[PDB]
């Protein structure tokens, strides 16, 4: 047992300095706005374009679009015209007798430009954590329909992370089917999800639209470009840094019954060019694994107090919300929460790893795990080998460049370290 002053105490990870990091998800998350219709009792999925037009008719404040925050590295008139083009093509759909299953758009110069026919460091913005927190919360809707599996499902079904799973399975499946069927065409794809309301009725939700570019996906790695056009009530001027990749239009005036009364708030459209791949789409389609996986994680945490007290305390832990796990960290103190919070926190982590999947995250995960093990052994006073901490910190920190989710994960590790080796 070597002398104290020789023992190595893992230092915090160094996060790069830079302009604040920017949104890089395939679709909006907390800033999303749904325009929704209540499905009939019989229900029966209608045609996406029909539903989309129906959903848009539930809003009554549409106005002439204008640019309120430009894409610095873009031709912003093309984004405005792209939106007007989408409305014109929806008008054309409306005028035909039958609604078609798919709509191929005119390949105008604005769409060809936008469909296209980063190693600079960034500092961690607070929006990333704020996102994670929103994913952890409960919505008033349930996004999943129907062991310890049942109690787990009660908790996550109304969870915002679960909305994101269903949103992402829908969009990626639409996008993939369009990619196979219409490789040359610029297809207009409604972004739709379905949920069940507190009252029990089924609801269809329009978040906006995606225009698919050319999609000759010979390989897994081959990329398809797309323009995303997404409603939101978020004013881009609150956090401009978040929206660096976007052109933002003002498209409408929305009425909200606020805490003072009826306010008019502007509705916006967040527009950007983005890309995806056969393999990335297929992974988006697999996002329901995120429920199986976080389920496995929770069942394993309930297989610790099941081989400690010689009797599974599932009905206990779930039925009694007096048992708590450490979940957050106010500088006030370590926030604790019911098994529900834990289920949702873990889901949100699994989901966010899917949504923000990247090479940086692959590196960070493989390396930070090994340091994590060392930190746990140090905390248990076990004297692990620290001889390779130099190589390990290097392997981790070369993954800390600009990816917002990796940066957040690094920042989380640093907090854990402080508390672990206090």
């Amino acid at each position: 047992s070597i002398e104290p002053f020789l023992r190595t105490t893992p230092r915090p990870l160094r996060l790069p300095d830079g302009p604040l990091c920017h949104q890089r998800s395939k679709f909006l998350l907390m800033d999303a706005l749904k325009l929704s219709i209540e499905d009939p009792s019989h229900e029966g999925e209608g045609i996406p374009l029909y539903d989309a037009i129906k959903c848009m008719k539930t809003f009554f404040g549409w106005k002439e679009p204008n640019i309120v925050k430009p894409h610095e590295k873009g031709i912003n008139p093309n984004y405005l015209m792209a939106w007007k083009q989408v409305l014109a093509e929806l008008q054309d759909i409306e005028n035909e007798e039958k609604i078609p299953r798919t709509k191929n758009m005119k390949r105008t110069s604005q769409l060809k430009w936008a469909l296209g026919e980063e190693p600079e460091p960034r500092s961690l913005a607070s929006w990333v954590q704020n996102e994670f927190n929103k994913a952890c919360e409960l919505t008033d809707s349930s996004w999943i329909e129907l062991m310890r599996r049942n109690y787990f499902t009660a908790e996550v079904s109304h969870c915002r992370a679960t909305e994101y799973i269903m949103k992402g399975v829908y969009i990626n499946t639409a996008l993939l089917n369009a990619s196979c069927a219409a490789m040359d065409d610029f297809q207009l794809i409604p972004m739709i999800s379905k949920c069940r309301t507190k009252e029990g009725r089924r609801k269809t939700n329009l978040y906006g639209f995606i225009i698919k570019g050319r999609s000759h996906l010979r390989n897994d790695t081959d990329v398809v470009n797309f323009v995303s056009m997404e409603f939101s009530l978020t004013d881009p001027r609150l956090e401009p840094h978040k929206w660096e990749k976007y052109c933002v239009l003002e498209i409408g005036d929305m009425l909200l019954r606020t805490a003072i009364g009826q306010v008019s708030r502007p509705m916006f459209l967040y527009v950007r060019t983005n890309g995806t791949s056969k393999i990335k789409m297929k992974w988006g389609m697999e996002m329901r694994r995120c429920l199986l996986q976080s389920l496995q994680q929770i069942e394993s945490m309930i297989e610790a107090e099941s081989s400690v007290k010689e009797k599974d305390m599932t009905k206990e832990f779930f039925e009694n919300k007096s048992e708590t796990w450490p979940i957050g960290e106010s500088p006030r103190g370590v926030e604790e929460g019911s098994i529900g919070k834990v289920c949702r926190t873990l889901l949100a982590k699994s989901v966010f790893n899917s949504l923000y999947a990247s090479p940086q995250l692959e590196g960070f995960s493989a390396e930070s795990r090994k340091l994590l093990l060392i930190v746990q052994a140090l905390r248990d006073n076990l004297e692990p080998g620290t001889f390779d901490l130099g190589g390990l910190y290097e392997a981790i920190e070369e993954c800390l460049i600009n990816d917002p989710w990796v940066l957040l994960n690094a920042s989380w590790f640093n907090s854990f370290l402080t508390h672990a080796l206090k």
Binding site: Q129, F132, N133, C136, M301, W325, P326, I327, G328, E329, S330, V334, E335, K341, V342, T345, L346, A348, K349, L372, Q376, W412, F413, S415, F416, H419, A420
Partner: peptide, 10 residues
């Protein structure tokens, strides 16, 4: 501010 790592400190 939720941090999944605090679950390691049960």
């Amino acid at each position: 501010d939720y941090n999944p790592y605090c679950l390691y400190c049960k």
